[PDB]
Amino acid sequence: AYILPANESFGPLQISLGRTVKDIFKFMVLFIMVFFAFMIGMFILYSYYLGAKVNAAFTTVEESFKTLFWSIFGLSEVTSVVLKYDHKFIENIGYVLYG
Amino acid sequence: RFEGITTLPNITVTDYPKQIFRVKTTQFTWTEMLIMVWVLGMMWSECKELWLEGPREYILQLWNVLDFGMLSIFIAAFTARFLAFLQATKAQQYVDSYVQESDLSEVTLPPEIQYFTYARDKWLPSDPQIISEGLYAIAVVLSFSRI
Ligand SMILES: CC(C)CCC[C@@H](C)[C@H]1CC[C@H]2[C@@H]3CC=C4C[C@@H](OC(=O)CCC(=O)O)CC[C@]4(C)[C@H]3CC[C@]12C
Ligand SMILES: CC(C)CCC[C@@H](C)[C@H]1CC[C@H]2[C@@H]3CC=C4C[C@@H](OC(=O)CCC(=O)O)CC[C@]4(C)[C@H]3CC[C@]12C
Ligand SMILES: [Ca+2]
After folding, report:
1. Helix A11-46 vs helix A61-70: angle between axes, to the nearest 10 degrees?
2. Which of A34, B5, B53, B121 could be joined to B57 by an S-S link, Cβ 3.0–4.6 Å?
3. Which among B133, B88, B132 has a CA at the least distance from the CA of B114?
4. What is the 3-state secondary structure (H, E, C) of B116-128?
5. Chain CA centroid to CA B139, Å
6. Cα dist from B68 to A33, A97, B38, B62, whole Å
7. Residue A20: Cβ-neighbour burial (10 angstroms; 0-12, 13-18, 19+)
8. CA angle B63, A97, A84 (to 5 degrees)
9. Secondary structure (3-state) at B99
10. How far apart are CA B147 and CA B133, in angstroms?
11. CA-CA distance, B146 to B48, in Å (whole number)?
């Protein structure tokens, strides 16, 4: 992309692409604050359930980050919320927060 | 718990032999004390704002309602945890005064207070501790809205 501006057909495209990348950086910062809100909140909810979950989704901070990030592209299942125990109150809170 | 809890939710770890497990789980820490003080101060400020202006003046603001909502849940979670702590304390007091059976392993406790030696799996679905952390997670999420 460094030598791309030299072309008349692809020059304007690479310039406009760089403009949007700068533009979305400000919007990405706002989503980071939202992303960090649910990462801490859902990790706290599911930290105590390590061996009591279908998967290890929200158990640790790293895994809470991984589960929430890949939910952006629809690559995280809804079974991230389901608990093995009958603590339906905590499970339904996870359903609402994830929703 | 940043890297997770070493102990499984099925095993109870008590520091000293005659401790009720629920006492250790539900006891407040120093960080818990500061958070409660912080929430109490923020709730106090919100009440003064409401008192001087009245309901209608205060109720029609997006930040004021959300601040009242997150502080109500924060107080709700702490009240539930204190109720769970009080129940554990009642079991603990009975244990150290009516049981002399060397670490609460061989002795069979009455079912009312025997429940306070169970791990997370055997907890009731509606016991205050589970309700406490269920509501506490909601308040933590709502906190970052004030950013
Ligand atoms: C097809 C596979 C095997 C290789 C593809 C690599 C391309 C992505 C690179 C290799 C050479 C590059 C080109 C080298 C020469 C030019 C001419 C350069 O200037 C011109 O368009 C001619 C008019 C002018 O220079 O004013 C603009 C960039 C461009 C198209 C480059 C565009 C990107 C190219 C095609
Ligand atoms: C402006 C401020 C003062 C609002 C604060 C309201 C709270 C002081 C009240 C309102 C709803 C109450 C809660 C309603 C539901 C429950 C479930 C309850 O669970 C049980 O005790 C049933 C199981 C059992 O222990 O047998 C624990 C207390 C709690 C959190 C209550 C604690 C006191 C709460 C939070
Ligand atoms: Ca206010």
Report:
1. 130
2. B53
3. B88
4. HHCCCCCCCCCCH
5. 13
6. 21, 19, 14, 10
7. exposed
8. 155
9. coil
10. 22
11. 19
> By the CB < 8 Å criterion, does A61 face chain B?
yes
Kindly list the residues from chain B whose CB atom is less than 8 angstroms away from the CB atom of residue A44: 133, 136-137, 140
| Best mutation site among B131, B132, B133 for ligand 2 pocket (most ligand atoms within 8 Å of CB) | B131
Q: How many CB atoms lie within 10 A of CB B11?
A: 12
Tokens of B147: 């950013």
Q: Which of A60, A88, A90 sits opposite B2 (nearest CB)?
A: A60
Nearest C-alpha neighbor of A84 from the set A75, A98, A94, A74:
A94
Report the structure determination method: cryo-EM
DSSP 8-state code for residue A91:
H
Structure tokens at B124: 């009731």
CA pair distance B84, B25, nearest whole angstrom: 10
Residue A83, helix vs strand vs coil? strand
* Among B71, B110, B76, CA closest to B94: B110
